[PDB]
Amino acid sequence: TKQYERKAKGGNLLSAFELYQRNSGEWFEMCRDYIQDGHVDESGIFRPDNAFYLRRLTLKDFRRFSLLEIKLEEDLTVIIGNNGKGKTSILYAIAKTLSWFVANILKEGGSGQRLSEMTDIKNDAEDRYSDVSSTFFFGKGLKSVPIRLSRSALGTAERRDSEVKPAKDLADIWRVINEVNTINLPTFALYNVERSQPFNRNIKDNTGRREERFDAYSQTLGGAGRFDHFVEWYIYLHKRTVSDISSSIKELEQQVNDLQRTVDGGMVSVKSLLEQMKFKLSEAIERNDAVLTESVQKSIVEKAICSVVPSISNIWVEMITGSDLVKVTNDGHDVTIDQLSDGQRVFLSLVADLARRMVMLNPLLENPLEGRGIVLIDEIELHLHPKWQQEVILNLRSAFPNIQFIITTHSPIVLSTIEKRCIREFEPNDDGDQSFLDSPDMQTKGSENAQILEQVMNVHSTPPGIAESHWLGNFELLLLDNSGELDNHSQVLYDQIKAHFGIDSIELKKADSLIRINKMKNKLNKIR
Template sequence: MEIKSITLKNIGLFEHLELPLAPTPQNPSNITVFVGNNGAGKTSILNALTISLSWFIARLSTEKGHGSYIAEDDILNGANGATIKVQVCDSVETSVYPDNTARDNDVQWTIAKTKKGRKTNYNSQLTDCSRLASYYRNALSQDAQVSLPLIAFYPVERVVLDIPLKIRTKHTFLQLDAYESSLSQGVDFRRFFEWFREREDAENESGISDEVLNQLKPLAETHQDIWQVLKELQASAKDRQLTAVRTAIRRFMPHLDNLRVRRKPCLYMAVDKNGETLNVAQLSQGEKSLMALVGDIARRLAMLNPALENPLIGDGIVLIDEVDLHLHPSWQRRLCDRLLDTFPNCQFILTTHSPLMISDCKNILVYALNNGKIQELPSQYGQDVNTVLLDVMDTSIRDPEFESKLNDLLDAIQDSNLSQAHQLLRELMAEPTHQNNLELVKAKLLLRKQELRHASHS
């Protein structure tokens, strides 16, 4: 499943906005990125997508289910009503159709809202949404192992809670439970930990745990045939869903490995970091945030695709607001590529403030927003960060006051106004933090060359 386009009327800052989303013929990757200042409307677009997709999830669960509604506060000031329309492409299983013929299922639906006491011609149109959800319910009725599309939204206020020492509430982790809070809560280590522990308990019951295998290793290594049988038994009992989660986290964070639940001396989630075993709670906020995000996407894919040998190739739609939040610049550089490598059939719609996110990945679709206006940008792949900051994000690469004085200094050197140049240089060098500034070092060299040139002509 993927969203081909979204059309907004009177939503947030947008009076009328129609946007195709990647993949497109010009941008074949599965990633669309929105950039812009705070308040430019990036989150409004993600929220609109969330409202529309919530109706598909609701009607997949029950025939007459209700999703989220447009809030009156989301309607453009001065407008009487608003609409959100999405066009979705979904290739439905062959068995769903009466004539057993698979086909690309292009559908669209509209969510409308009229302000109280006003009148408009806007009406919600949910026939296609209900029809698509009905197709999936039919498929589930015929085959409980059929794959379902992932739909998830991770807001800026995504939650990363501490892992609980005790689990007091019993939860179900059935296939449709993968949609629980998928559009409202973001990431939650508590639910992730409970799911992980339940799967690992089942994995250990059906096979040999790593701890037991390590204890048997000294005894069994003298009998290689027995040792080989034990390792094969362990490998065959590995839980497919847990393997998917561990694989996804390892691809994003190669320095972390072997995520597992430890039960002694107390219950906690452990991970090996550069060969050292740590409690996940000991990781940095950035590490925990990324692990929770990637782990949650992989967990939901694993639950929704119970028959896939590799659930990470399942399809779906993932919305992430400020995807660069808490991430080191080196992680920001690789994030888009790793999303595509790890979840190749998911469509990602992201917002960011990081120039590295759009300059280090090929074929992504980038939109720049500014006060309700939107512009599709040419590829920024290979551009240096300063160029992206200046040209795309309209942000100076230096402090504006320092930039102005530096330009005055360079102009004075160029005009051979040496006394003024020396005065400006002294003022700039008065700040201790400027002593080793590369631009000032260059300016000093230029000034010295200009002085030598004048001396040779005198």
């Protein structure tokens, strides 16, 4: 139509796509360029011209919320609050919405997930239905993609319909354009507290092929990730990389060169081994000479894991025992994955899974980890020592620069690494009627954790339920009651403070300071 032509020439993606579908060159290329075009910034990071992120979320009579509106950041949003404030509810709502994109990328007219009629409607909602309304952004050509998931309570006569067609329309563009000419695809993933499973290598899934590109969408919003799928995929990559003779020749050439240097250095004991390896190299060269994408994929993932996971310096596959084993160098020691602590394993699992999916979905990028997507992580600090909490968000954002992260945390240490604009905080005595969430008043990034406890988490830096926490206050009051002189009562308490906290304690130093100041104040008063 002439109307569609005008809009399309104005840069509207949906109009361009409609024209392509009816006339089935120009319009195809418009759609493909809209999705693929980008640039490398000053920092050497690829940036798509058309960003994809969740802009806004609205919850009506959903779980604890009567009516709640959230504006999200393009890059990082962190939701904070006490237990039972609905932080997990918010992520669940988003994940269910994203399921509609994933379903329709996989299959025309595919079905996403649903709100529960048993559990998701607010218990005291007068109207017996719930709505989750989301709006997504995809560049200036598609500023608004609205979705609504709805559900009526069980046994209600009137049934409220979901509105999902815009999700389907956008997902159709990705699917159809990709079919004709390969494009990069968005990553969607949820990592909830269910990610903390015991590992079993022994259990294998024999459903689907792991090297099939659309396996990247397999159970992506299920909450655990599929760390088992990673291991299988990584072993697969290893076997293929070993099998191609040129890399084996290059590896063998490198081994021969290293062994030759050792023999030249005076170690005559390794001469027999050098001769064997030289023979193997000659044989390999004689067998027909030939870069493996699988080798590059393997390297990317290895780097990602080692960069993000602090205790892990190396990861590799062994087959010499006779079974396939993934090993890691953890704190300088070579161990199996099963030998990792739960904290290390769970975090490794998250990063490995995410990296695998990004590599699979972004084959045309030089760095596939610079692809687009939305990743939800519940309780990022789960199982992490405070040392790790100080460098978890930084590492994630460095490794995955174009992902929109939506995170929940209870950790002041995590908050100390994040800008106040990224933080969304529940009102202290909300009770489910608050309309809009807001940022804290205090700047958190670079701030002391004690301040964040008090100013942002609403918790005393010193435990009020412990008597010893009040001794210094009581001591000060006694000193002021006796015009600054240590009486019998003040001396007893002083001795208690000394005995309990120790001679070198900050508390005792404060007490000493109080004595000195009050004595001097009294002396001044007497002079006057």
